[PDB]
Design a protein around this nucleic acid. Structure first.
Ligand SMILES: [Mg+2]
Ligand SMILES: [Mg+2]
Ligand SMILES: [Mg+2]
Ligand SMILES: [Mg+2]
Ligand SMILES: [Mg+2]
Ligand SMILES: [Mg+2]
Ligand SMILES: [Mg+2]
Ligand SMILES: [Mg+2]
Ligand SMILES: [Mg+2]
Ligand SMILES: [Mg+2]
Ligand SMILES: [Mg+2]
Ligand SMILES: [Mg+2]
Ligand SMILES: [Mg+2]
Ligand SMILES: [Mg+2]
Ligand SMILES: [Mg+2]
Ligand SMILES: [Mg+2]
Ligand SMILES: [Mg+2]
Ligand SMILES: [Mg+2]
Ligand SMILES: [Mg+2]
Ligand SMILES: [Mg+2]
Length: 181
RNA sequence: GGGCAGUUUGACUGGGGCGGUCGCCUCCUAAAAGGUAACGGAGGCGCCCAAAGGUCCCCUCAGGCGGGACGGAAAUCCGCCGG
């Protein structure tokens, strides 16, 4: 379904807007999203995959994609780790799914967040990319209360083509990133 | 069943006994081929695997810095450097 609200926002408003502050000589120099990634540090449930099939299908609902497990590399008995028996979930959503996802998060997820106040602006890692954590996961649409057996939040990475994050700072605000400023 | 009989009771060893050692692999001694001794300096083997094998196909580390709900020097995710 190559169409949606935010998908347009970037073109018929946000694309030229960027050219206003930086004036790119070329049509591609103008930064774009192209990679949204999500990861859950469930080393907590690394014991039994029992409490894991759930957070997977839960994650799948809110993202549309079928998540992919991530094994342990090292081994640390300091907290029950060895080989690859452990666990973590990772899902790389791009294309349309990325937009239909970012619409929910910026227009539904964030606002219903317990005592929200604005995304931390410092979370820009030199190059144009943003990261942020969420203690809960029920702050998503298609998640009912009686469904969650345990509150397990996570964090999402978003990747732009922006070289410097100075530019990136702008591209996010223009899409709908409520920065704490 | 030492009353009695026939015997055995290793070698190396700055004398012998005591101690230590005895076969195999790696490194140094070894003097830029090979080989090379000392009771010279240092360490391992007496197994393991039906996947830890065959072939076809695909992927590339450790580490460092920055950013990230548990995490917290170190779990998993993203970015940059890294032969
Ligand atoms: Mg007898
Ligand atoms: Mg007798
Ligand atoms: Mg003498
Ligand atoms: Mg002697
Ligand atoms: Mg004597
Ligand atoms: Mg002796
Ligand atoms: Mg030994
Ligand atoms: Mg092997
Ligand atoms: Mg490759
Ligand atoms: Mg260090
Ligand atoms: Mg760091
Ligand atoms: Mg950090
Ligand atoms: Mg870090
Ligand atoms: Mg953190
Ligand atoms: Mg927790
Ligand atoms: Mg500590
Ligand atoms: Mg850290
Ligand atoms: Mg990385
Ligand atoms: Mg970077
Ligand atoms: Mg090399």
């Amino acid at each position: 379904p190559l169409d949606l609200a935010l998908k347009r926002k970037y073109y018929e408003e946000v694309r030229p807007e960027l050219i206003r502050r930086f004036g790119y000589q070329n049509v591609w120099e103008v930064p774009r999203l192209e990679k949204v990634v999500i990861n859950q540090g469930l080393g907590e449930a690394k014991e039994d995959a029992r409490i894991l099939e759930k957070a997977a299908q839960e994650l799948a609902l809110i993202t549309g994609q079928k998540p992919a497990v991530t094994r342990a590399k090292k081994s640390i008995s300091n907290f029950k780790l060895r080989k690859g028996m452990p666990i973590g979930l990772r899902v790389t959503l791009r294309r349309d799914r990325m937009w239909i996802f970012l619409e929910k998060l910026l227009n539904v997820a964030l606002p219903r967040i317990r005592d929200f106040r604005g995304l931390n602006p410092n979370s820009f890692d030199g190059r144009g990319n943003y990261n942020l954590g969420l203690r809960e996961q029920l702050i998503f649409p298609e998640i009912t209360y009686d469904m969650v057996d345990a509150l397990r939040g996570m964090d999402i990475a978003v990747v732009t083509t922006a070289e410097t994050d100075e530019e990136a700072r702008a591209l996010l605000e223009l899409l709908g990133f409520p920065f704490r400023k």
